[PDB]
Design a protein around this ligand. Sequence first.
Ligand code: CAC
Ligand code: CAC
Ligand code: CAC
Ligand code: CAC
Ligand code: MG
Ligand code: MG
Ligand code: MG
Ligand code: MG
Lengths: 260, 260, 260, 260
Amino acid sequence: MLKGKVAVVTGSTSGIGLGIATALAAQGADIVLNGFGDAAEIEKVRAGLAAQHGVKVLYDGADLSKGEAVRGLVDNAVRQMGRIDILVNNAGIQHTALIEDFPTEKWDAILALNLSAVFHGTAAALPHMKKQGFGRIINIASAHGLVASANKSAYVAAKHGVVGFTKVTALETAGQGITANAICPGWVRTPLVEKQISALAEKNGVDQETAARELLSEKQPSLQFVTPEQLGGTAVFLASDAAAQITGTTVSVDGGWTAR
Amino acid sequence: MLKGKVAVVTGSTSGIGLGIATALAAQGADIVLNGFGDAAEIEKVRAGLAAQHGVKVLYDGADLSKGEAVRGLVDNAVRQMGRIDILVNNAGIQHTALIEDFPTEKWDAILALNLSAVFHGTAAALPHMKKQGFGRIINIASAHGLVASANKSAYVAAKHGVVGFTKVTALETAGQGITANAICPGWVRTPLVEKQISALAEKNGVDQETAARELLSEKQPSLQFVTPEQLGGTAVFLASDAAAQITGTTVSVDGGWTAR
Amino acid sequence: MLKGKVAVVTGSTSGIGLGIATALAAQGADIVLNGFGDAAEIEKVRAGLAAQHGVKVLYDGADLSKGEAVRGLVDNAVRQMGRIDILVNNAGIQHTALIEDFPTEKWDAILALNLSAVFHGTAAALPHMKKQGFGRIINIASAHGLVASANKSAYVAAKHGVVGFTKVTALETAGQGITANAICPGWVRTPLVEKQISALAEKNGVDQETAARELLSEKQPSLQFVTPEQLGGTAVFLASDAAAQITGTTVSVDGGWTAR
Amino acid sequence: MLKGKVAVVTGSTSGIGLGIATALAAQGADIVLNGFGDAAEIEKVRAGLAAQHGVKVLYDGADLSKGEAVRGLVDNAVRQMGRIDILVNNAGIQHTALIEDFPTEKWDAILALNLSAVFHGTAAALPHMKKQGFGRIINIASAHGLVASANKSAYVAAKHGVVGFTKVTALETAGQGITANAICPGWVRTPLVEKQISALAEKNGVDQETAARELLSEKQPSLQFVTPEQLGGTAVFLASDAAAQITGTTVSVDGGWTAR
Ligand SMILES: C[As](C)(=O)[O-]
Ligand SMILES: C[As](C)(=O)[O-]
Ligand SMILES: C[As](C)(=O)[O-]
Ligand SMILES: C[As](C)(=O)[O-]
Ligand SMILES: [Mg+2]
Ligand SMILES: [Mg+2]
Ligand SMILES: [Mg+2]
Ligand SMILES: [Mg+2]
């Protein structure tokens, strides 16, 4: 369990982020949610999580594209919750295009959220973790933080950056009760992905599930999607005492993506 | 939990292997112990484990250096336990010497036990796991399956082979409800390592714990040993449904060894 | 040889960059130099290289911290030289400090030059290379693009980013006569490093060379520095026809740094 | 150049090994050929090579599956050639089958030749290289020493072991004027692969070259084969002084195989 601990999860108002925040809450950890979205809908999620798991749940709409904002998200978390035991840097954005066609504005935005945001968040939380003698920095990178795909230069670059940053984080905190690791997910069945499937479903005129496997065939050997619940359970493990000596490494949850 | 599941662990009469069998048994899984040791003490361990966790526990002293013996271990486990959901290939041995001074006999022995045993055990288990629709093969490799250390050629080569063998195993079973991963431990405080600490403590004229940190300094940033309880906890995570899509990968538990 | 080909090397007015530019010029390749420095001194280097190797050598002081400037460097190279066969993205900057003490301004500058500069340069050259059916993008990353060191988060993050970006570059150009690889250097004996040695030379009161080995002991097993000439010879190899099917990978020149 | 140097290449009577021995011989190095084949044709190759490059060329048909035979190859090479500056461990064999269907005999044979041979050869060569103050051990591994493919367990495991063994070799020799690296080839158009292309071309009813691209599509992004001339060129680079500080690493020549 994680009773008495505080977890801050960026981009957790939905999808993967929400899956991890939910997994941590179920372990008895207080949660600070974050990300853009509908204020009303967001409150519903927050209150729903708080009630369902009997833990304190807050929401900070801090803009992760801004360094001061990310650092502020962490400070206020400590001010409201009293400490920050776990920091899950999850927020991510993407864009597909050949390198020579890749918009500089897109490249900069992707680096800012997927990479720089991890630095600012980590920089803000480290002092508190070193003081308390306990810390768990869980960066959600990607299979693309280990290998590449054509047309995703900025994302691949940013994610690799995260893995490298995770390693440094671990070395600077080694032995202080703090660990830093990066979960590298393969395909996850997001709403936009679902529309990508339906785009192939009506492209080949096959049922959704067949299209699903079609979409996974190229990169994911298992032909099965990774779920937010599994990624939550992975974050839960890394935050456990059994993962005390697991630091500066990656945990690939990709159905065999990086094995071949 | 793992209630209703059968886990076989090679080299589990003590240390790492024992820690793993215990963590699994603690989750409700029936256990099959194995490994060379003292018959009297082995029975005490076997009986104690069964009584402690209220699960069926057997012991098979099959000689892991013998291919047919490894397969026999698996075969008999199925016959006596009813199935084999989890296979933890843990047994290993080492020898230190320059390549040119490495006895061919030692080279052959390390490869047979540290690598070939994983193949024979995996081969015998796969038909059952594929038929059951469930399987978790967990190979206890080492940080030396990812990086190298001078004077440990046979061990590094064998462990590297284990990581590779693990990846193939995953690809051949992808999607069939079976996963295969390799846990890569760093320094563990075994009884033989303890003697190493004492020897160093004497040579340097410092306390046992100062020597421990000193011994760990070159390879393990944390300056803390990995424990059999931690590795057991890691195996428990990998055998869980949360790790259903974690396959063909490595999970480093090395206090930062491989981060730098 | 590389007669008739054009090479653009960023940050080549001195050190590693100049070593590579010199190595390429010696192969008969026209060169476009770049980087900040003394205008007069720079001209001396340019004219000296041109005369010594009988090839056309130009100098473009374009500021690599600016995206439009990097792209301009490449365009003008093509305008003046007639094409761009080889692009060596070398320019790098660093800063040592704990993550929580790392200045955002420093983090941003490091990412901008060491990572973003590679993207802009590559984006500008790709159209020309795809048109001509020949290309060699040689990114000078670092051992830190593969592993980490404490207190160098931004550099480690940027370099890892470069390796990931190099992989994408390769995949988007695979089979088009273009390859993209990243040379990952270990310790190189730079002027600032020389002062780091002399700082240890007078710190332990030992001769320079002893201090040199002292400085290399922790990360570089060979206890020998990598030279700009060796890095030049490595770039030369990757640009050769024999390296036609070497793409999307790294070439570690680190005296065993990443082997352990 | 490599004039005055002696290079021994296992499995060099044809294909990759031959391409490597030829590139080395082309640089002025004396050569020692080896490998099973037709005596008559082997002599034609041996004699031709010596005449073509004006260097001494011998042939030793030592059975690489025998440990003492491998060491004998090295021993005799020194006695007849005067020394051994370069050792290229190239010989290899394969077999495809599911793990549970993999013959133990095949598993043992692949490990003996693909992995143990590298150990025996390295062990016999090291004493001479350390005494000479010069040495270049080049192990021809494979992309399968870094990643995996289904149904190739023994090959992947053995090649992975070779990469690991290469790293240890480098660390044990670091600084002594000796380097040890592993070249990791992707698809090469061997005579047996040619038959594979024809078979596929027939089954798909397409021309030989269309089938070639089709066969390469799954693993090699470039859709182009790696050549023995390229691998020879790669070996020549690694044996050069420019690669003096390249040690304990892998050089992937796989058309992008390992980038994704
Ligand atoms: C494979 As990706 C999840 O990080 O979109
Ligand atoms: C570093 As170990 C526990 O594999 O000897
Ligand atoms: C090891 As570094 C050269 O890239 O300063
Ligand atoms: C992929 As290969 C040339 O090692 O068979
Ligand atoms: Mg609203
Ligand atoms: Mg007894
Ligand atoms: Mg001036
Ligand atoms: Mg004949």
